Design a protein around this ligand. Structure first.
Ligand SMILES: CCCCCCCCCCCCCCCCCC(=O)OC[C@H](COP(=O)([O-])OCC(O)COP(=O)([O-])OC[C@@H](COC(=O)CCCCCCCCCCCCCCCCC)OC(=O)CCCCCCCCCCCCCCCCC)OC(=O)CCCCCCCCCCCCCCCCC
Ligand code: BCL
Ligand code: BCL
Ligand code: BCL
Ligand SMILES: CC[C@H]1c2cc3[nH]c4c(c3C)C(=O)[C@H](C(=O)OC)c4c3nc(cc4[nH]c(cc(n2)[C@@H]1C)c(C(C)=O)c4C)[C@@H](C)[C@@H]3CCC(=O)OC/C=C(\C)CCC[C@H](C)CCC[C@H](C)CCCC(C)C
Ligand SMILES: CC[C@H]1c2cc3[nH]c4c(c3C)C(=O)[C@H](C(=O)OC)c4c3nc(cc4[nH]c(cc(n2)[C@@H]1C)c(C(C)=O)c4C)[C@@H](C)[C@@H]3CCC(=O)OC/C=C(\C)CCC[C@H](C)CCC[C@H](C)CCCC(C)C
Ligand SMILES: COC1=C(OC)C(=O)C(C/C=C(\C)CC/C=C(\C)CC/C=C(\C)CC/C=C(\C)CC/C=C(\C)CC/C=C(\C)CC/C=C(\C)CC/C=C(\C)CC/C=C(\C)CCC=C(C)C)=C(C)C1=O
Ligand SMILES: COC(C)(C)C/C=C/C(C)=C/C=C/C(C)=C/C=C/C(C)=C/C=C\C=C(C)\C=C\C=C(/C)CC/C=C(\C)CCC=C(C)C
Ligand SMILES: COC1=C(OC)C(=O)C(C/C=C(/C)CCC=C(C)C)=C(C)C1=O
Ligand SMILES: CCCCCCCCCCCC[N+](C)(C)[O-]
Ligand SMILES: CCCCCCCCCCCC[N+](C)(C)[O-]
Ligand SMILES: CCCCCCCCCCCC[N+](C)(C)[O-]
Ligand SMILES: CCCCCCCCCCCC[N+](C)(C)[O-]
Ligand SMILES: CCCCCCCCCCCC[N+](C)(C)[O-]
Ligand SMILES: [Fe+3]
Lengths: 302, 281, 240
C-alpha cells in the first residue's frame, strides 16, 4: 500500500493568509474566519476572508429575501405548525400565476403574486452575484473566465424562469419553488413536449454532462498521479513545463493517441462544462416556442 | 511520431505480462499485452455487431441495435440471432474495457506515475457492469440489460425509469444527480480559475496561485486550493458514478414499486403522521 | 425550421471549437520529431497556432509558445531496434542519468516564487511561524527504504508558504548531509517514515540542492524524477 494523496498525512499552518492586494478595496474584506482541521485533511484549512462590498450586500440581502419569501409561503401552507412544516417540507411549493394572468403582475399574492416577488429577488440576487464574479476578477487583474462561465449557467436559469415564459406569453410556464414540485415540473415538461430524449440539444447537454464527469475524473486523476512531481502547480507548469506536465501528456498520448497541455486541458475543461447549459438552454428555449413535440420534429428531422 | 520531449521516457519496462514481447508503440499508441488484448476484444466485438446488423437487416448507425435475450431465456444462453450475439459482444466489451484499464496500468508503471487514472476508469466499468451484468443477474434475466443501439438504449432508459413512476424519486438517483451537477459546476470553475490566472488582463503578468486562492476567498469566503480542487473533481465525478450504480442496483431488486411512494416513510412517522393541515393532512 | 438551423449551426460551431482546442493544445511538444530528433514527415492535420506570449512576474521574462523545442540536456538512451517504435535502453545508470521514469526536465534553475516575490517553498524552520497543525509530526523519525534498512532521519518539513502545505521532507543521511524527499512519496507512520520507491543505498544518490534554504524548479524536477524512478529501478532490492 502506497500513499495516494487523496487526504493529507500532515497538515501545516502559518500566519493567516490575507491574500493578494492588487486593486482590491481592502476596506471591504472581512477578517479571517476560523481554521478547520477537518477541511485541511482534503483542502485548505483556512476560512475567509471574504469580500463584502455593497454589491455583495445587495445579492445576499436579495438572495435571503428570495429564500424567506418561499419559506414564509411554506409555513403558511403548513398552517404555521412546525411539525407539519418538517413533515411536508419537500411537498410544499410556491407556484407561478395561472395561465389566465398571462405576463401581468396582477395575480393575487396567494395565487402567483408571491411567486413573482420571490422571482424578482432571485433575479437581482443572481445578476448582482454575476457582477461580483466579474468585479472580483477585475480588482485582481485576472481574466473574466469565471463570469463568462457563470453566464452559461445563468443562461439555462434565465431560459427556464424568464425568457421562455415571456416568449410563451405567461408566467405559468415557469418553474415552481419546491423540492418535489420542481421535479414534477421537469417530468411534465418532457411528457408535454413529446419526450426530451428526442431533442438533439438535450442529448448534447447530456453528452457534455457525462463528458464533464469523464473529463474531471481524467484530469483530477492525472494531476494526482503526477503530484509526486508537483503537477498541481499548474500555473508554473504552464510557464515552465516540468516532468509532471510531460508524464501527464504522455500517459494520454500513449493511451489514446493525443494529449493536452497544462494550459490547454483547462480550456477543454471550461468548454466541456459550459456547453452543458449552453446547449441545454437552447433545447429548452426552443421547446414550445418553435417545437411543440420533439418526437414529431425528429420524424421530419425538421 | 514523437513529441519533442518524448524519447527519454520510452524506455523498456513496466509490463504486467509478457516481459518485452509486446513492449513497443505503434505511432503514438503504447501496445503491451493489454493493447493486444484490447484489439482482439474490440475487433471481435465490432465484427459481431456487424454480423448482428446483417441478421437485423440494416447498416444504418441510427438503426443498428443489438438486443439481449428476451426475459424467457432467464440467465441461459440464447440463439445468436436472438440474444446470443448480445451476450458475446458483452463479454467482448468487458474484456476490452478491463484490458484498456490494465494497459493504462502498464503505461503508469513505465512513466513512474500514480495509478489514479485506471482506478478512476474502473468506476465507469463497474457502472457498465451494474447495468449489463450485476443487475440482470440479481433480477434473474439478461433481458433486463440495455440493448446496444444508439436510440434503442434510450428507449431502455425511458421504459426502465417509468417502470417505477418518475425515476426522479429514487433517492440514490437524487444524490448521483447532485454530484453530476456539482462536478460540472466545479469543472467550469476550475477551468475558468486557472485560465483567468494564466491569461490576465491585457499587458499584465500571469497571476499566481496566491491570486487564485484570493479570488475565491473574495468571492465565497473559501478556497479549497490547487491540490484540493483536483481531489475534489476526482471525488465528485467518481461519487456521481458510484451513486448511479447504487441507484440502479437497488432498483428492481430491493425496491421495485413506485419510487415516489418510498418517501411516505417520513410522512408516516408517528409524531406527525396524523396532524391535520399541510399537504399530507 | 429554426430548430434545424440551430442544430446545424451548433455542429459547425462545435467543429470550429474542437479545431481551436486541439491547436491550443499543441503549444508544447510540437512539431513532432523522429526518434533521432529531426522533424517528422507527418505532422497530422492540425497546424501550429499563432504564438502567444505569457508575461512572467518578478522580472522572470516571458514565454512564447509555440517556440523552438529542445531538451537542453543529454539523454543517455540508445535504440534497441532497427526500426521506429521500440524502447530505448539506458546507456548507463538510468537513475543517475535521469531517463525513463527517473526523467527530469531542464526547468529554470530558480525557485518558484509566491505572489509577493518570495520563495514559495522553504524549510519550515525558516518559515515564520509555520508549524505542524495536525497529523503525526514526521520530524525526528527514522527513514526506512524498500530494502527495510534505515537510510536517515527527518530533520525538517519544507512547506509551501502561500498554499500552507507540506511539500518535502528533509532527511539527514549517515554522512550528515541532507536530501529532499517528495511528501507524495513517503508514508508517515507512528515509528518511522517509509519510502517504498528507494532502497537505503540509493538515498545518497538523490540530487542535492545548491543552497540549503531554497530549492529551484530544476532541482525539484531532478529530485522528484529520481525518487519516482526508484519504483522501476530499485525493484530488484524490494522486497515485501
Ligand atoms: C445562444 C446562447 C447564449 C450565450 C450565453 C452565454 C455564453 C457564455 C460564453 C462562455 C465563454 C467561455 C469562454 C471564455 C473565453 O475563453 O473568452 C474570454 C474572452 C476574453 O478573456 P478575459 O478573461 O477578458 O481576458 C483574458 C485574455 O485577454 C484572453 O483570454 P483567453 O485567451 O482565454 O480568450 C481568447 C479568446 C478570444 O476572446 C473572445 O472573444 C472569446 C469569444 C467567445 C465566444 C464564442 C461563443 C460561442 C457560443 C456558441 C454558439 C452556438 C451556436 C448555436 O479566444 C476564444 O475564446 C475563442 C474560441 C473559439 C471558438 C471558435 C469557433 C467556432 C466557430 C466556428 C466556425 C468556424 C469554422 C467551421 C468549421 O472574453 C471575451 O471577450 C468574449 C466574451 C463574450 C462577451 C462579450 C459581450 C459583448 C457583446
Ligand atoms: C449512462 C446511463 C445510460 C445511458 C444514458 C444515455 C442518455 C440519456 C443519453 C445517452 C447518450 C449517449 N450514450 Mg448512453 N447510456 C448508457 C450507456 C452508454 C454506453 C455504455 C455503457 O457502453 C455508451 C458507449 C453510451 C454512449 C452513448 C452515446 C451514443 C451518446 C453520447 C454519450 C457521451 O457523450 O458520453 C460522454 C463521453 C464522451 C464525451 C466521450 C465520447 C464517447 C462517445 C461519443 C462514444 C460513442 C460510442 C457509440 C457510438 C458506441 C459504438 C461502439 C463501437 C462499436 C466501438 N451510452 C446507459 C444505458 N446515454 C445521449 C444521446 O444523445 O444518445 C442518442 C443521451 O441523451
Ligand atoms: C422525465 C425527465 C426528462 C428530462 C427532462 C429535463 C428537463 C425539463 C430539463 C432537462 C435538462 C437536463 N437533463 Mg434531462 N430529462 C430526462 C432524462 C435525462 C437523463 C437520463 C435519462 O439519464 C439525463 C442524464 C439528463 C440530463 C440532463 C442535463 C444534461 C440537463 C441539465 C443540465 C444542468 O446542469 O442543469 C442544472 C443547471 C442549472 C439549472 C443552472 C443553475 C442556474 C444558476 C443561476 C443557479 C442559481 C441558484 C441559486 C440562486 C440558489 C443557490 C442556493 C445555494 C444554497 C447558494 N436528463 C427525462 C427525459 N431534462 C435541462 C435541459 O437543459 O434540458 C435541455 C432541463 O431544463
Ligand atoms: C425517463 C427516464 C428517467 C431516468 C431513468 C434513468 C435510468 C433507467 C438510469 C438513469 C441513470 C442516470 N440518470 Mg436518470 N432518469 C431520468 C432523469 C434524469 C435527469 C434529469 C435532469 O431529469 C438526470 C440529470 C439524470 C441523471 C442520471 C445519472 C445519475 C445516471 C446516468 C449516468 C451514469 O449512470 O453513468 C455511468 C456511466 C456509464 C454506464 C458509462 C460506462 C462506459 C465505459 C465503461 C466504456 C464505454 C466506452 C466505449 C464503448 C468506447 C467507444 C468507442 C470510442 C473509444 C469512443 N436522470 C428520468 C426521470 N436514469 C442510469 C444509471 O444510474 O446507471 C447506472 C440509469 O440506468
Ligand atoms: C456551467 C454549468 C454549471 C454551473 C456553472 C457556474 N455556477 C456558478 C458559477 C459558474 C461558473 C459561478 O461563478 C457562481 C459561483 O459564485 O460559484 C461559486 C455559480 C453558482 N452556482 C450556484 C448554484 C447552482 N449552480 C448550478 C449548476 C451549474 N453551475 C452548472 C452545472 C446548480 C444546479 C445544478 O441546479 C445550482 C443550484 C451558486 C452556488 C453560485 C451562484 C450564487 C448566487 O447567484 O447567489 C445568489 C444568491 C445569494 C447571494 C444567496 C442566496 C441565499 C441562500 C439560499 C441562503 C443560504 C446561504 C447564505 C448565503 C448564508 C449567509 C448567512 C450570513 C448572513 C451569515
Ligand atoms: C467514472 C467517471 C466517468 C468516467 C471516467 C473515465 N472514463 C474513461 C477513463 C476514466 C478515468 C479513461 O481512463 C478512459 C479513457 O481512455 O478516456 C479517454 C475512459 C473511457 N471512457 C470512455 C467512454 C465513456 N465514459 C463514460 C462515462 C464516465 N467515464 C464516467 C461519467 C461514458 C458515458 C457517460 O456514457 C462513455 C461513453 C472512452 C472514451 C474511454 C474508454 C475506451 C475503451 O475502453 O476502449 C477500449 C474499447 C474499445 C476501443 C471499443 C470496444 C468495442 C466493444 C467491444 C463493442 C461495443 C459494445 C458497446 C457496449 C456498445 C454501446 C452502444 C451504445 C450506443 C450504448
Ligand atoms: C494535465 O494533464 C493532462 C493532459 O496532459 C497534459 C492530458 O493529456 C489530458 C487528456 C485530456 C485531453 C487530451 C482532452 C480531450 C479529452 C476528452 C474530451 C475525453 C474524451 C476522449 C475522446 C473522445 C477520445 C477517445 C479516443 C480513444 C479512447 C482512443 C481510440 C483508440 C483506438 C483506435 C482503439 C483501438 C485499439 C487500441 C489503440 C489498443 C492499443 C493497441 C494497438 C495500437 C494495436 C488530461 C486529462 C490531463 O489532465
Ligand atoms: C425554517 O424557516 C426558515 C425561517 C429558515 C425559512 C425556511 C426556508 C425554506 C424552507 C425555503 C425553501 C426553498 C426551496 C425549496 C427552494 C427551491 C427552489 C428550486 C428547486 C428552484 C428551481 C428552479 C428555479 C428557476 C428556474 C427560477 C428562475 C427564476 C428567474 C429566471 C427569475 C425571473 C424573474 C421574474 C419572473 C420576475 C419578473 C420581474 C422583473 C421586472 C425582472
Ligand atoms: C475553482 O475551484 C474551486 C475552489 O476554489 C479554489 C473551491 O474552493 C471550491 C469550493 C469547495 C468546497 C468544499 C465548498 C464548501 C466550502 C466549505 C467552507 C466547507 C470549488 C467547488 C471549486 O471549484
Ligand atoms: C460555497 C462555499 C461557502 C463558503 C462558506 C463561507 C465561509 C465564510 C467565512 C468568513 C468569516 C468572516 N468572519 C467570521 C471573520 O467574520
Ligand atoms: C469540449 C468539446 C468536447 C467534444 C465532445 C462532443 C460529444 C458529442 C456526442 C454526440 C451526441 C450527438 N447527439 C445525438 C447528442 O446529438
Ligand atoms: C469521437 C471519437 C473519435 C475517435 C478519434 C479520437 C481522436 C484520436 C486521434 C489520435 C490519432 C493520432 N494519430 C494520427 C497519430 O494516430
Ligand atoms: C461541495 C461538496 C458538497 C457535495 C454536495 C453534493 C450533494 C450530495 C449530497 C450529499 C450526501 C452525500 N453523503 C455521502 C454525505 O451522503
Ligand atoms: C472530444 C472531441 C474529439 C477529440 C478527438 C480529436 C482530437 C484528436 C487530435 C489528434 C491529433 C494528434 N496529433 C496528430 C496532432 O498529434
Ligand atoms: Fe487543473
Amino acid at each position: 500500500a502506497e500513499y495516494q494523496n487523496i487526504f493529507s498525512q500532515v497538515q501545516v499552518r502559518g500566519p493567516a493568509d490575507l491574500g493578494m492586494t492588487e486593486d482590491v478595496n481592502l476596506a471591504n474584506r472581512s477578517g479571517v474566519g476560523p481554521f478547520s482541521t477537518l477541511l485541511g485533511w482534503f483542502g485548505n484549512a483556512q476560512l475567509g476572508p471574504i469580500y463584502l462590498g455593497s454589491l455583495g450586500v445587495l445579492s445576499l440581502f436579495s438572495g435571503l429575501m428570495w429564500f424567506f419569501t418561499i419559506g414564509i409561503w411554506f409555513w403558511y401552507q403548513a398552517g404555521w405548525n412546525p411539525a407539519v412544516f418538517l413533515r411536508d417540507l419537500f411537498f410544499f411549493s410556491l407556484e407561478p400565476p395561472a395561465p389566465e394572468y398571462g405576463l401581468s403582475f396582477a395575480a393575487p399574492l396567494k395565487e402567483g403574486g408571491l411567486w413573482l416577488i420571490a422571482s424578482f429577488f432571485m433575479f437581482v440576487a443572481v445578476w448582482s452575484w454575476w457582477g461580483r464574479t466579474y468585479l472580483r476578477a477585475q480588482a485582481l487583474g485576472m481574466g473574466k473566465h469565471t463570469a463568462w462561465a457563470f453566464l452559461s449557467a445563468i443562461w439555462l436559469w434565465m431560459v427556464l424562469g424568464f425568457i421562455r415564459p415571456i416568449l410563451m406569453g405567461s408566467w405559468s410556464e415557469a418553474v415552481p419553488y419546491g423540492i418535489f414540485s420542481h421535479l414534477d415540473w421537469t417530468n411534465n415538461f418532457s411528457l408535454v413536449h413529446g419526450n426530451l430524449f428526442y431533442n438533439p440539444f438535450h442529448g448534447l447537454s447530456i453528452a457534455f454532462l457525462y463528458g464533464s464527469a469523464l473529463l474531471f475524473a481524467m484530469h483530477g486523476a492525472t494531476i494526482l498521479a503526477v503530484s509526486r512531481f508537483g503537477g498541481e502547480r499548474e500555473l508554473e507548469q504552464i510557464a515552465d513545463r516540468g516532468t509532471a506536465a510531460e508524464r501527464a501528456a504522455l500517459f494520454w498520448r500513449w493511451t489514446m493517441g493525443f494529449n493536452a497541455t497544462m494550459e490547454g486541458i483547462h480550456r477543454w475543461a471550461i468548454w466541456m462544462a459550459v456547453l452543458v447549459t449552453l446547449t441545454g438552454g437552447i433545447g429548452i428555449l426552443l421547446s414550445g416556442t418553435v417545437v411543440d413535440n420533439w418526437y414529431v420534429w425528429g420524424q421530419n428531422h425538421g | 511520431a514523437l513529441l519533442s520531449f518524448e524519447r527519454k521516457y520510452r524506455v523498456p519496462g513496466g509490463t504486467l505480462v509478457g516481459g518485452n514481447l509486446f513492449d513497443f508503440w505503434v505511432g503514438p499508441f503504447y501496445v503491451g499485452f493489454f493493447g493486444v488484448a484490447t484489439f482482439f476484444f474490440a475487433a471481435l466485438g465490432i465484427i459481431l455487431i456487424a454480423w448482428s446488423a446483417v441478421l437485423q437487416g440494416t447498416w444504418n448507425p441510427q438503426l443498428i441495435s443489438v438486443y439481449p435475450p428476451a426475459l424467457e431465456y432467464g440467465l441461459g444462453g440464447a440463439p445468436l440471432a436472438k440474444g446470443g450475439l448480445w451476450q458475446i459482444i458483452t463479454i467482448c466489451a468487458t474484456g476490452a474495457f478491463v484490458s484498456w484499464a490494465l494497459r493504462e496500468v502498464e503505461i503508469c508503471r513505465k512513466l513512474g506515475i500514480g495509478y489514479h487514472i485506471p482506478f478512476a476508469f474502473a468506476f465507469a466499468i463497474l457502472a457498465y457492469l451494474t447495468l449489463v451484468l450485476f443487475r440482470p443477474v440479481m433480477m434473474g434475466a439478461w433481458g433486463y440489460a440495455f440493448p446496444y443501439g444508439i436510440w434503442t438504449h434510450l428507449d431502455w432508459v425511458s421504459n426502465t425509469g417509468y417502470t417505477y413512476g418518475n425515476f426522479h424519486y429514487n433517492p440514490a438517483h437524487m444524490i448521483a444527480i447532485s454530484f453530476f451537477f456539482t462536478n460540472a459546476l466545479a469543472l467550469a470553475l476550475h477551468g475558468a480559475l486557472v485560465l483567468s490566472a494564466a491569461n490576465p488582463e491585457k499587458g499584465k503578468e500571469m497571476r499566481t496561485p496566491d491570486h487564485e486562492d484570493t479570488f475565491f476567498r473574495d468571492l465565497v469566503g473559501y478556497s479549497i486550493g490547487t491540490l484540493g480542487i483536483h481531489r475534489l473533481g476526482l471525488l465528485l465525478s467518481l461519487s456521481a458514478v458510484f451513486f448511479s450504480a447504487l441507484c440502479m442496483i437497488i432498483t428492481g431488486t430491493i425496491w421495485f414499486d413506485q419510487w415516489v411512494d418510498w418517501w411516505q416513510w417520513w410522512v408516516k412517522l408517528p409524531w406527525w403522521a396524523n396532524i391535520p393541515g399541510g399537504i399530507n393532512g | 425550421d429554426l430548430a434545424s438551423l440551430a442544430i446545424y449551426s451548433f455542429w459547425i460551431f462545435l467543429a470550429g471549437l474542437i479545431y481551436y482546442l486541439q491547436t491550443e493544445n499543441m503549444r508544447e511538444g510540437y512539431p513532432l520529431e523522429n526518434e533521432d530528433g529531426t522533424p517528422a514527415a507527418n505532422q497530422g492535420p492540425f497546424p501550429l497556432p499563432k504564438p502567444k506570449t505569457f508575461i512572467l512576474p518578478h522580472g522572470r521574462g516571458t514565454l512564447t509558445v509555440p517556440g523552438p523545442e529542445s531538451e537542453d540536456r543529454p539523454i543517455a538512451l540508445a535504440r534497441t531496434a532497427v526500426s521506429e517504435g521500440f524502447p530505448h535502453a539506458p546507456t548507463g545508470d538510468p537513475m543517475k542519468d535521469g531517463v525513463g521514469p527517473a526523467s527530469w526536465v531542464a526547468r529554470r534553475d530558480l525557485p518558484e516564487l509566491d505572489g509577493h516575490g518570495h520563495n514559495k517553498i522553504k524549510p519550515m524552520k525558516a518559515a515564520a511561524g509555520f508549524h505542524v497543525s495536525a497529523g503525526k509530526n514526521p520530524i525526528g523519525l527514522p527513514v526506512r527504504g524498500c530494502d527495510l534498512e534505515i537510510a536517515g532521519k527527518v530533520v525538517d518539513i519544507w512547506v509551501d508558504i502561500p498554499e500552507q502545505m507540506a511539500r518535502f521532507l528533509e532527511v539527514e543521511l549517515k554522512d550528515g548531509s541532507t536530501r529532499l524527499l517528495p511528501m507524495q512519496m513517503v508514508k508517515v507512520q507512528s515509528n518511522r517514515v517509509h519510502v517504498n520507491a528507494l532502497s537505503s543505498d540509493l538515498f545518497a544518490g538523490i540530487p542535492t540542492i545548491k543552497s540549503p534554504t531554497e530549492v529551484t524548479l530544476l532541482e525539484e524536477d531532478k529530485i522528484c524524477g529520481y525518487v519516482a524512478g526508484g519504483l522501476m529501478y530499485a525493484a530488484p532490492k524490494r522486497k515485501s
